[PDB]
Write a protein that binds this ligand. Structure first.
Ligand SMILES: CCCCCCCCCCCCCCCCCC(=O)OC[C@H](COP(=O)([O-])OCC(O)COP(=O)([O-])OC[C@@H](COC(=O)CCCCCCCCCCCCCCCCC)OC(=O)CCCCCCCCCCCCCCCCC)OC(=O)CCCCCCCCCCCCCCCCC
Ligand SMILES: CCCCCCCCCCCCCCCCCC(=O)OC[C@H](COP(=O)([O-])OCC(O)COP(=O)([O-])OC[C@@H](COC(=O)CCCCCCCCCCCCCCCCC)OC(=O)CCCCCCCCCCCCCCCCC)OC(=O)CCCCCCCCCCCCCCCCC
Ligand SMILES: Nc1ncnc2c1ncn2[C@@H]1O[C@H](COP(=O)(O)OP(=O)(O)OP(=O)(O)O)[C@@H](O)[C@H]1O
Lengths: 49, 50, 125, 173, 104, 63
């Protein structure tokens, strides 16, 4: 209530924006069977674009 | 569910067998003990035997 | 062969032929990836054999299983870090060319970084 | 400045502050196989502290909720006569105070050690929070940048060759 | 149960030394007591000590299935607190520790 | 007091060098050394190089 408070602003419009598929930035220490999740995220991004 | 991934790196358990006081049980053809193994998956669209 | 020998041989061959009969059964709703090629499989096996050759002296000399387990766990973490990337790229790979590229990257990363890390940790131990 | 600054469960004014809800959410997206024994020990100590802290939070919030319930009932203190209404209305006021307290982040030496560690465990936890918990990682990265921590996972990284994966809140350059 | 005294207090300083050496829940204390009993009247003799060690070998062999050469090829004969008599090697090491602890 | 002062003033000479790379590396390697129990040095050709005897001699000289 007196010091720096991080903002809560976020993207509210772009679909599936926060479904972050694994890459170099996020490393590859995720759950092993998230390869299908990454593939589905890639397909959804392709469909959007 | 989720399919078997193309590659898995598996640690060889150590100390399971105390016979003759040998911690390592797997030895490579070149004559060196093995601590890790690579298991590969082919034909992911296939059942696993019971 | 005798009856018992024939029965034992039949048992061995049937136990080995599980894949032959499980191949025919396949599932439709399946996420199917391109399997890694045999050449790349052999290259990765050779890289792991080189790592084991590097590691053998220290582990053999060590007499307490705890240190061996610690070394194994550290090297396993290092290798699994790259294994995750290899699996992610191979599963998304859309051709044997992409699969071979991913396998080559994985094996080169082993041969350089894993070799350096294994030498460093073995010297530290 | 107490006489137990060594204590791991203790904290400082400028140490990394994490909420109990954020800590419990972070616990969900972590794997013990991928952490070193030192990191596992750090997490176990953090759980040891949190076990008592979470249970004590409602104890801390009780007086505020009691006062709020009394004010809502009115300006009459009737002792045992008003217990029914006091504790029936306080049964919803106290949850609100606990909600505020839990949403409030608190500094902790263990929190800063686990998040800001410059080793494999620190990198792993930061990347897992960044990927599987983008909402928490956004606030955590804002806090770290404000407190002068530089890591490649931070969205406020000005020396990165790759675009950030999350909205970058306004801040002073 | 298989020791020489109806209770551990009747046993001399060797039983107390075994209890100190091993944790209270570690059942290798019984093997250490067996080593003490084997070493009674033999530790103070150069040949008696070797005879007690052979007795420990025989005791371990009769307690657990073992092969010829395991006890000779044991790497470390030292014992820690969390060592349990789950193997002939552990039994033999505990018996040797008891023999060493035995004074008279 | 007189003897201590005289000895200190006589034998005090600041190190007028820069610690060499070998000295720094040895200081870093001396993290785990202890005189309570001697370390069991193990020769791995793939990380030490040279010959086993030469490596053992160098290790004995260093530590
Ligand atoms: C022999 C001679 C020797 C030689 C020397 C000479 C010695 C001579 C004699 C010396 C005598 C010295 C003492 C002088 C007299 C003192 C009198 C006195 O204190 O009473 C006056 C005091 C008020 O004075 P008053 O003038 O009579 O009345 C004022 C008005 O009536 C107006 O009052 P009111 O009606 O508006 O309100 C009364 C009360 C009516 O309401 C209640 O009674 C509340 C009932 C529900 C409580 C919550 C659920 C149950 C408890 C859960 C506890 C969980 C946490 C436990 C944590 C333990 C570890 C820290 O509401 C409150 O004010 C609530 C306060 C108590 C909250 C509960 C405290 C829990 C423990 C502490 C936790 C930390 C504090 C913050 C969190 C608090 C909430 C948990 O009377 C009371 O009402 C007594 C209340 C007692 C509450 C006890 C609760 C115990 C809970 C169980 C135990 C929990 C674990 C404990 C640790 C482990 C071991 C068990
Ligand atoms: C960490 C612990 C705490 C965690 C709490 C977490 C939150 C849980 C909330 C759950 C419920 C939702 C909220 C409801 C709000 C209701 C507000 C309201 O109007 O109620 C106040 C209302 C006020 O009454 P009143 O008409 O104004 O008269 C009071 C006077 O002014 C005289 O005033 P006084 O000051 O002298 O005494 C009054 C005192 C009277 O209350 C107390 O002293 C209890 C305080 C602690 C409450 C603990 C909640 C449950 C926690 C989980 C279970 C742990 C074990 C609990 C063991 C102790 C019993 C609660 O009232 C309070 O403490 C005020 C706060 C009460 C909050 C609500 C309590 C819900 C109780 C639910 C279970 C009832 C059956 C239990 C049977 C026994 C099972 C072993 O009192 C109640 O409704 C409470 C009744 C408690 C009955 C306890 C019976 C004990 C067993 C005796 C018989 C044993 C037979 C054994 C047979 C077998 C032998 C072999
Ligand atoms: N594979 C095993 N087979 C049988 N008993 C075992 C095995 N692993 C452990 N134990 C039992 O657990 C005890 C503790 O095991 P621990 O992991 O400490 O063994 P260690 O590191 O190989 O060395 P040590 O023989 O000194 O205990 C061993 O003394 C033995 O009693």
């Amino acid at each position: 209530l007196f010091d720096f408070n991080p903002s809560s602003i976020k993207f509210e419009k772009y679909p599936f924006y926060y479904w972050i598929n694994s890459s170099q930035l996020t490393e590859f220490n995720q759950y092993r069977k998230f390869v299908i999740r990454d593939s589905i995220i890639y397909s959804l991004n392709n469909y959007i674009i | 569910p989720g399919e078997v991934l193309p590659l898995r790196i598996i640690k060889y358990p150590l100390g399971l067998e105390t016979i003759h006081n040998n911690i390592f049980e797997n030895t490579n053809n070149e004559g060196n003990v093995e601590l890790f193994r690579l298991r590969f998956n082919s034909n992911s669209s296939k059942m696993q035997h019971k | 062969m005798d009856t018992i020998q024939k029965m034992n041989y039949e048992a061995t061959v049937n136990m080995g032929r599980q894949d032959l009969i499980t191949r025919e059964y396949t599932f439709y709703s399946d996420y199917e990836f391109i399997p890694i090629q045999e050449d790349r499989k052999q290259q990765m096996e050779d890289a792991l054999n080189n790592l084991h050759k590097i590691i053998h002296p220290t582990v053999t000399q060590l007499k307490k299983k705890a240190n061996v387990q610690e070394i194994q766990d550290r090297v396993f973490r290092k290798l699994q870090g790259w294994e995750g990337e290899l699996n992610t790229c191979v599963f998304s790979a859309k051709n044997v060319r992409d699969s071979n590229f991913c396998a080559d990257r994985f094996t080169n990363r082993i041969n350089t970084e894993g070799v350096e890390f294994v030498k460093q940790i073995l010297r530290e131990y | 400045m107490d006489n137990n600054y060594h204590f791991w469960g203790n904290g400082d004014r400028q140490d990394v502050s994490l909420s109990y809800e954020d800590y419990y959410s972070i616990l969900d997206c972590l794997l013990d196989e991928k952490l070193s024994p030192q990191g596992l020990m750090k997490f176990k100590n953090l759980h040891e502290v949190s076990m008592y802290g979470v249970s004590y939070v409602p104890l801390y919030c009780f007086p505020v909720a009691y006062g709020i319930s009394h004010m809502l009932t009115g300006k009459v203190r009737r002792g045992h006569s008003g217990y029914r209404n006091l504790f029936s209305l306080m049964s919803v006021v106290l949850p609100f105070t606990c909600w505020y307290a839990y949403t409030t982040p608190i500094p902790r030496r263990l929190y800063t050690e686990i998040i800001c560690s410059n080793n494999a465990d620190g990198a792993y936890v930061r990347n897992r929070i960044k990927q599987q918990k983008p909402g928490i990682w956004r606030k955590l990265s804002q806090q770290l940048y404000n407190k002068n921590f530089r890591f490649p996972e931070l969205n406020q990284d000005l020396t990165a060759t790759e675009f950030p994966l999350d909205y970058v809140a306004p801040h002073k350059f | 149960a298989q020791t020489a005294h109806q209770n551990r207090y009747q046993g001399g300083l060797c039983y107390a030394q075994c209890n100190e050496l091993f944790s209270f829940w570690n059942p290798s204390i019984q093997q250490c007591w067996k080593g003490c009993d084997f070493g009674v009247g033999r530790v103070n003799d150069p040949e008696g000590r070797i005879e007690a060690q052979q007795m420990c070998k025989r005791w371990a062999a009769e307690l657990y299935w073992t092969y010829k050469g395991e006890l000779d090829t044991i790497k470390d004969l030292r014992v820690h607190a969390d060592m349990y008599p789950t193997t002939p090697q552990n039994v033999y090491r505990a018996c040797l520790a008891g023999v060493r602890r035995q004074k008279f | 007091y007189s003897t201590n002062k005289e000895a200190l003033i006589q034998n005090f000479e600041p190190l007028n060098r820069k610690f060499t790379e070998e000295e720094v590396e040895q200081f870093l390697r001396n993290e785990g050394r202890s005189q309570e129990e001697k370390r069991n040095w193990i020769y791995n050709p793939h990380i030490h190089g040279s010959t086993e005897g030469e490596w053992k001699a160098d290790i004995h000289e260093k530590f």
